[PDB]
Design a protein around this ligand. Sequence first.
Ligand SMILES: Cc1cc2c3c(c1C)C(C)(C)CC=[N+]3c1c([nH]c(=O)[nH]c1=O)N2C[C@H](O)[C@H](O)[C@H](O)COP(=O)(O)O
Ligand SMILES: Cc1cc2c3c(c1C)C(C)(C)CC=[N+]3c1c([nH]c(=O)[nH]c1=O)N2C[C@H](O)[C@H](O)[C@H](O)COP(=O)(O)O
Ligand SMILES: Cc1cc2c3c(c1C)C(C)(C)CC=[N+]3c1c([nH]c(=O)[nH]c1=O)N2C[C@H](O)[C@H](O)[C@H](O)COP(=O)(O)O
Ligand SMILES: Cc1cc2c3c(c1C)C(C)(C)CC=[N+]3c1c([nH]c(=O)[nH]c1=O)N2C[C@H](O)[C@H](O)[C@H](O)COP(=O)(O)O
Ligand SMILES: Cc1cc2c3c(c1C)C(C)(C)CC=[N+]3c1c([nH]c(=O)[nH]c1=O)N2C[C@H](O)[C@H](O)[C@H](O)COP(=O)(O)O
Ligand SMILES: Cc1cc2c3c(c1C)C(C)(C)CC=[N+]3c1c([nH]c(=O)[nH]c1=O)N2C[C@H](O)[C@H](O)[C@H](O)COP(=O)(O)O
Ligand SMILES: Cc1cc2c3c(c1C)C(C)(C)CC=[N+]3c1c([nH]c(=O)[nH]c1=O)N2C[C@H](O)[C@H](O)[C@H](O)COP(=O)(O)O
Ligand SMILES: Cc1cc2c3c(c1C)C(C)(C)CC=[N+]3c1c([nH]c(=O)[nH]c1=O)N2C[C@H](O)[C@H](O)[C@H](O)COP(=O)(O)O
Ligand code: NA
Ligand code: NA
Ligand code: NA
Ligand code: NA
Ligand code: NA
Ligand code: NA
Ligand code: NA
Ligand code: NA
Lengths: 206, 206, 206, 206, 206, 206, 206, 206
Amino acid sequence: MSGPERITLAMTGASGAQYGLRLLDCLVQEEREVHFLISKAAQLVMATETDVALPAKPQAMQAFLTEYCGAAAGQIRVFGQNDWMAPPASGSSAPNAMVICPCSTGTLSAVATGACNNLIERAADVALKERRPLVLVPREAPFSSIHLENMLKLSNLGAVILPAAPGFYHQPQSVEDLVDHVVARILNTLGIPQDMLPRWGEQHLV
Amino acid sequence: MSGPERITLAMTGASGAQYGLRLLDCLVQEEREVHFLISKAAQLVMATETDVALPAKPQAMQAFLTEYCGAAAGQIRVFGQNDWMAPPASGSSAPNAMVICPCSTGTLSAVATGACNNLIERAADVALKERRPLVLVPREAPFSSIHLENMLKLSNLGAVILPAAPGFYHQPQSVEDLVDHVVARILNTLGIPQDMLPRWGEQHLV
Amino acid sequence: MSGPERITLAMTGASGAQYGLRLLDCLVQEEREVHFLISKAAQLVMATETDVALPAKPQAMQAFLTEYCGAAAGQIRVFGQNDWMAPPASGSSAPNAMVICPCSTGTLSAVATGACNNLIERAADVALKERRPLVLVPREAPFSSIHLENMLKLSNLGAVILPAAPGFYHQPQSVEDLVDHVVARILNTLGIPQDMLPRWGEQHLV
Amino acid sequence: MSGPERITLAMTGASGAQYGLRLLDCLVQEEREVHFLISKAAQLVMATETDVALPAKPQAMQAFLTEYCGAAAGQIRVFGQNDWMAPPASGSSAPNAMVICPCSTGTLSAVATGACNNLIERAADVALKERRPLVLVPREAPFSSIHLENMLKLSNLGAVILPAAPGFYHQPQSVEDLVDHVVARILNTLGIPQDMLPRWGEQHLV
Amino acid sequence: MSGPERITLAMTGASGAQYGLRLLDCLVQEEREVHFLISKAAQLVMATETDVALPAKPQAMQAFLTEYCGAAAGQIRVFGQNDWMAPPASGSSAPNAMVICPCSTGTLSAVATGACNNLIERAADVALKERRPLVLVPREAPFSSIHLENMLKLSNLGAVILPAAPGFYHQPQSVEDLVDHVVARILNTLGIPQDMLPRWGEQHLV
Amino acid sequence: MSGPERITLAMTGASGAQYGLRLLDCLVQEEREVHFLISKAAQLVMATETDVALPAKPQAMQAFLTEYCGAAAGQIRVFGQNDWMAPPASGSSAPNAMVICPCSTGTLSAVATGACNNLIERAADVALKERRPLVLVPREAPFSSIHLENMLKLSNLGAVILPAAPGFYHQPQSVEDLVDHVVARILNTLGIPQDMLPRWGEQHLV
Amino acid sequence: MSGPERITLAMTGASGAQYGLRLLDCLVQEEREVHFLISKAAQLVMATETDVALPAKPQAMQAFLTEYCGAAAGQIRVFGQNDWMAPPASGSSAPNAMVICPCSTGTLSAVATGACNNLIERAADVALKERRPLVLVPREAPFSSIHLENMLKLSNLGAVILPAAPGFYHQPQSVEDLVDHVVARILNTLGIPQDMLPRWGEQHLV
Amino acid sequence: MSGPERITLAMTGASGAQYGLRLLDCLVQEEREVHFLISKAAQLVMATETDVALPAKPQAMQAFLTEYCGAAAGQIRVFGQNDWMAPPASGSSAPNAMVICPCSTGTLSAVATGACNNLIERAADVALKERRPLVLVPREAPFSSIHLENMLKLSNLGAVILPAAPGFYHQPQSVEDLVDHVVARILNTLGIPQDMLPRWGEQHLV
Ligand SMILES: Cc1cc2c3c(c1C)C(C)(C)CC=[N+]3c1c([nH]c(=O)[nH]c1=O)N2C[C@H](O)[C@H](O)[C@H](O)COP(=O)(O)O
Ligand SMILES: Cc1cc2c3c(c1C)C(C)(C)CC=[N+]3c1c([nH]c(=O)[nH]c1=O)N2C[C@H](O)[C@H](O)[C@H](O)COP(=O)(O)O
Ligand SMILES: Cc1cc2c3c(c1C)C(C)(C)CC=[N+]3c1c([nH]c(=O)[nH]c1=O)N2C[C@H](O)[C@H](O)[C@H](O)COP(=O)(O)O
Ligand SMILES: Cc1cc2c3c(c1C)C(C)(C)CC=[N+]3c1c([nH]c(=O)[nH]c1=O)N2C[C@H](O)[C@H](O)[C@H](O)COP(=O)(O)O
Ligand SMILES: Cc1cc2c3c(c1C)C(C)(C)CC=[N+]3c1c([nH]c(=O)[nH]c1=O)N2C[C@H](O)[C@H](O)[C@H](O)COP(=O)(O)O
Ligand SMILES: Cc1cc2c3c(c1C)C(C)(C)CC=[N+]3c1c([nH]c(=O)[nH]c1=O)N2C[C@H](O)[C@H](O)[C@H](O)COP(=O)(O)O
Ligand SMILES: Cc1cc2c3c(c1C)C(C)(C)CC=[N+]3c1c([nH]c(=O)[nH]c1=O)N2C[C@H](O)[C@H](O)[C@H](O)COP(=O)(O)O
Ligand SMILES: Cc1cc2c3c(c1C)C(C)(C)CC=[N+]3c1c([nH]c(=O)[nH]c1=O)N2C[C@H](O)[C@H](O)[C@H](O)COP(=O)(O)O
Ligand code: NA
Ligand code: NA
Ligand code: NA
Ligand code: NA
Ligand code: NA
Ligand code: NA
Ligand code: NA
Ligand code: NA
């Protein structure tokens, strides 16, 4: 197996709920264990932007997502926003890679300053102190200087700032094609196999 | 008329040629005069990503774009990359707003450092020294710290860093819907009317 | 009409509730549409420092403030602290100027770091990314270096840091006279007519 | 006796002459020795904003202020703006605490840069090099980034930046009540007894 | 009317008195109200470099300049260097744009540090805190790092640093032609009509 | 296999063409796939400093280098300076490590600022945004502060700054021995086996 | 002989071609050897702003300039923009002082960042690393913060930033008089005799 | 005589003992007085890398080096590492230029921080405070960010950072040829004649 066996996937309240759901689906299909976290504002984004009827409490959310993705039992773990006994909350936990997708500007801010106000923010704080992979997927426009300084600080610290900015260079034909471009970039960054985005120039000899 | 009468629209070599073309179309439909600039690498992006057969030389490019957009005579001006006699090259020119869409990381770098190697880069240098509007639309992922520092410097100077990061919160049904979200943000930033992106919460009283 | 048609007026938990109320009154009398936001701590300041019996829920607060100011129907909109569907929460909203008066040091901090924890903080984050006017009215003493660095960062970004520091140079005779000095400065900054603070030296020829 | 026996009280040309006069009165009533300094612009502020007829030359100013405050003989010393033989001008002097109230933005600038152009500015330069207390009471609005950077530099060096921003949380009934709030904060900062501002929550057990 | 109705025009002691006089003439011919300020060192520059016999006291200076420019009564106001009751000294004044032309390196320094030692320096301090236009026209060579850091700080704050560096690209035939180039740039920056500098490339279609 | 299977080897115009050629030879002998890039100025360095008759066009250059190194078919790929369809130009490409050897101060500058003016510079920009290995081998003396700041920025970002500064501590007997020291350091940095530089102190027990 | 025997004189594409030509003339008349470099954009400036018919290729340009200045044979050397075998390209060359006059903002940028894209930029990079004199003569207005930061960086490194800002204090009577002021400043900076600008106050005893 | 009459030559513990010895030889042949200093670690480098049997104590080391170089009596002075009475230890000494060749990263660090732990480090501290020439010849690879920041600080202060990075552009045929390139660069930097490195392009006319 290439790439991390366990991924902490946090969804926070920026537009782009489809990116998180599609990423979750691909992680499940690659037989990865996913520790799934979702903020209160992200739950509202999902209700506004999609037809997914995501249950509110973690136990029922875990059942729903398992059915939605066709995951194995225990493959998707769901942890609530104040569950400090969950693996992502401590560096003594087993190593995960972490993705925040979408990453709201508020969560971006909290991770940059170390606010640790909820399990998503603490889990990123832990990823940085343990030097485990951390990928942030912001979705905002314009990016203000406040946004950019927070992204730059975290990038300087080794976090990967991967904006939800799909490329158009494989003739996209649908919204789903654009979503897949970003999801493929994330999987590439994590080192996890994907077949949605070809290897640029791989056939190009001279 | 709300917003600028004249817009310098530069296209540079990031993916997202559709954003530039659609923005050009909307500017024409709003009866704006457009000074159109396109880099050599952007011409290659357009040939790779779209079915637009854009002529190479400025005179023929100007004819093509006028037909493509249904523009009036002289409404679209095309200037070549070393035409230092064109309006965008001097601050003594008449005031324009400027948009670089897409904005490659190379053009982002040149504007941040003041390289002024071609008319697109000099025109942005002029926009900054004259404190005229400058909007950059980067399309890249991940954003490295090199990218982010250049974006932050320019944002601190008053340029608008508007990444090609479409929002999903008006139920997009096609690639064109996502393109329009970004194009609408640009038009909003310039203060030019648009009807593709509703005013959020405008009906919301309490 | 001079100045902004719509103003987001946020009250947060620093002493000086009278400044916010008087500013709200003047905005109403200038026929401006006001999107009114108030933090939980500010509600407690108002109960401690004034005899205003402000209702707690937005619907009833909106009724009360309309009566208090003699506003027209719909002229004052009240939005709760987690109402992400309200206009101030998105840059795709119609343009407002924004004033935080009083601005607590906690809200000052959140805006400086981009925390976006509630609608007041997100609305300021949106004002900065859209380059729409943002005026902060802190009331604190001493200002620590933590306070000052946050004020300096935001001032460098174009926010107006307007401390609740009334001037004495028009022979004030009451608390209300000192309140009006600050409120007049805010209206001047927004470009909205006021007749409480004369134009200094306007009659002075030589 | 709690707090400093000797206080250098400098008045400079910001609005708020009443704060300086009331502070001088309270220092006298607490039996402190006051080295009183006043700038040329502050003399003009006092003539504009109050009915105090302050004599111009130090000898007569010293007589007037002694009568005004009911001070003992020699309790108030007045020194002119170029009197480099006065105690405040040398660090070899006996230790004083220093307050500049009001502190103009020009005096703020001079102290931040070390300009030492007059006795007020040199005395503050001496307070900083000897690490003796220095309290600045600016009165300005907006604070520009120039103001804020100067305040931040001095706060980082241990000066207390105490803006003339009265609090409203003890039901003020007059201009004098608001003046007293700021004067009480200054006395608190110096460690000198005052009974104008109660100790917040002192009776609050749980 | 395009551009500001009122302009504060300060002349300080760099070489280039002709620029200030010609700018004053053009502002008068565009029917603008001018608040004219001149430093002691600038008066000496004018006596050294020109044949203008400028009276020393403001009242007589105001009479002379009115005759010199052919201005209407009250169109040119002259204020002395310590006239703190003049409009430029307070932000509560009516809005002006401000130009310092020529701008000595000493006045550049004072504005960068906030020294506010005279009415010219305070008026610029007020322009910055009120975010009203401020244009500085330095004339010096070489620019030292001290000069450049002061110019950069002020440019970062939104002041326009416009050096007296005339362009040669409209075939200048006299000293007056070079003066007019700089004066035209200033008028362009203020948004005030001028016909001395053509709009570059305005006729250039492709 | 230890170390990267694919290496992008860029040669740019600093003295030390022998280092690049010898590194290319060792990579081939370790059965690595090499994507070979060479700048116009580097071609001139090679003609000036060596007797290698390197063909100019990529197709013929690829034939020559394959013969020169005894490489397998397709093992060395050559890409021209504007071939944006080559793998190194996009982060969606398959992962490579990248070495610029020699690295001119001009290419050092471009990578530090993100200029992306040609395929070598873009490929390094891509290596940094994808956090793939990037090794720069500058050859210059003195290093100016411009050089050093660019090297420091890139080192802080995780690029390896490996100057062409051979060590003398294995009794070098020829120019080739000194070349091999640097080439061995590069291979060590990449994690690729080499037998030219012994493991220091490997036999040293106490 | 006072001052440098050899001067590298680079002309780049800012307005002010007359300054470069007049400086070249004075260097020739002082019997200095001049290594003359001119950018493509500067050639266009010279054709636009003057009646000098400068040949394009270096050999013919060298003949023309020798006749134009009345120079001795070999006294003016002309080198093309990619002639890396010319003395200015290597620090191992014989010591020259270097002047870029006019210095475009693009060349200013390249020297500040170390871009070294052509012989002019590399020659300045070499002057800085060898700590040989480097004088830049920018001609631009306004100077943006991008311009100013580049000038400040280079000034901090010991380059002389000498803007084309002529002084008026020797009663100039023509364009040529203003040109000579700047040219005289450059010669003063290089330590080369000139008689166009008197020594200020040289006769002034007390 | 061109260049300094007296040179402090310090050898510290980086590889490249041959550079120091060859530089010492050339300084002697140019009839310069050399104050020779060598660290304990450098003595070990010399024993490891060369066949020079350098005596340990200064008196015998001075005899050996005089014979080795064929120096005149008293032409080479040797001072021990704690000889604070030696000329290099005080700025009141007669002016020397100073070279540290090789310069270990430890000595680089000490000079950058001012550690002054031995005579070599103090002598460099003295060279910097007296603004006398200081040339550092580091030999290390990779350069870490710790190395680079120390080199940048010292370069900004006017020290010459000259890495042991020989050039290959005069067809080197032996180790000695590469050593001579670096030694020639050092002599060039000091302004001392050398005939090992030709003047680049000196014969190149056009
Ligand atoms: C509920 C909500 C919140 C949006 C929002 C919307 C919704 C429905 C949309 C989808 C209609 C439009 C855009 N949204 C974005 C957004 N923040 C952001 O950084 N990017 C966004 O694209 N916000 C605000 C963000 O959710 C708030 O600032 C939260 O405080 C974030 O909290 P969290 O980090 O804990 O999720
Ligand atoms: C030709 C080409 C260049 C791409 C590229 C592609 C093509 C076809 C695609 C479309 C297949 C994939 C992505 N592209 C991007 C890109 N640079 C960038 O910042 N974002 C991009 O999305 N690059 C590189 C960029 O064009 C180069 O760095 C140019 O030097 C930019 O030059 P310019 O600023 O003058 O346009
Ligand atoms: C309830 C409360 C909070 C005061 C306070 C008081 C009250 C009654 C007063 C009125 C008696 C005295 C002073 N107050 C101030 C204050 N914060 C501040 O920056 N300036 C103040 O003047 N605070 C604290 C501030 O409200 C808290 O730090 C909140 O967390 C701010 O939260 P908010 O930004 O969401 O309003
Ligand atoms: C005379 C004068 C000067 C005012 C002023 C007024 C007057 C009458 C008022 C009272 C009508 C309105 C406001 N004033 C302020 C002010 N500077 C400042 O920082 N805050 C102020 O509130 N200024 C300007 C300030 O006095 C000048 O910049 C002086 O140079 C300060 O010099 P100083 O530090 O030596 O006192
Ligand atoms: C009187 C005087 C002062 C010159 C000067 C001359 C004169 C006659 C000239 C005209 C002969 C030559 C050049 N001048 C300049 C100059 N300062 C400057 O920045 N640029 C200049 O070009 N100075 C110095 C400047 O005037 C002093 O530093 C003043 O202190 C500035 O004070 P101010 O800002 O209040 O005007
Ligand atoms: C042609 C050429 C260019 C040399 C040069 C020489 C040649 C023959 C030598 C070999 C004779 C001597 C030294 N060279 C160096 C050099 N730049 C550098 O950083 N280190 C060097 O050692 N330069 C300059 C460098 O090539 C230019 O600045 C190019 O613009 C670099 O462009 P590139 O990065 O695209 O290759
Ligand atoms: C051809 C051209 C280019 C001008 C220009 C004009 C012309 C005719 C004028 C003379 C009509 C007006 C002003 N010019 C200036 C200018 N750049 C600058 O920094 N200052 C200037 O004054 N520019 C732009 C500058 O030449 C470009 O940015 C080039 O890329 C510079 O390239 P270079 O550094 O290699 O010369
Ligand atoms: C004895 C010794 C020390 C080497 C070393 C070796 C030896 C034999 C070699 C020659 C086998 C290989 C490389 N050497 C280097 C080195 N430090 C350095 O900056 N560059 C080097 O090339 N070091 C370490 C350096 O000498 C130590 O860090 C000392 O503390 C430096 O002390 P000094 O500055 O007082 O001389
Ligand atoms: Na917390
Ligand atoms: Na250029
Ligand atoms: Na939050
Ligand atoms: Na002084
Ligand atoms: Na002052
Ligand atoms: Na480019
Ligand atoms: Na280059
Ligand atoms: Na020590």
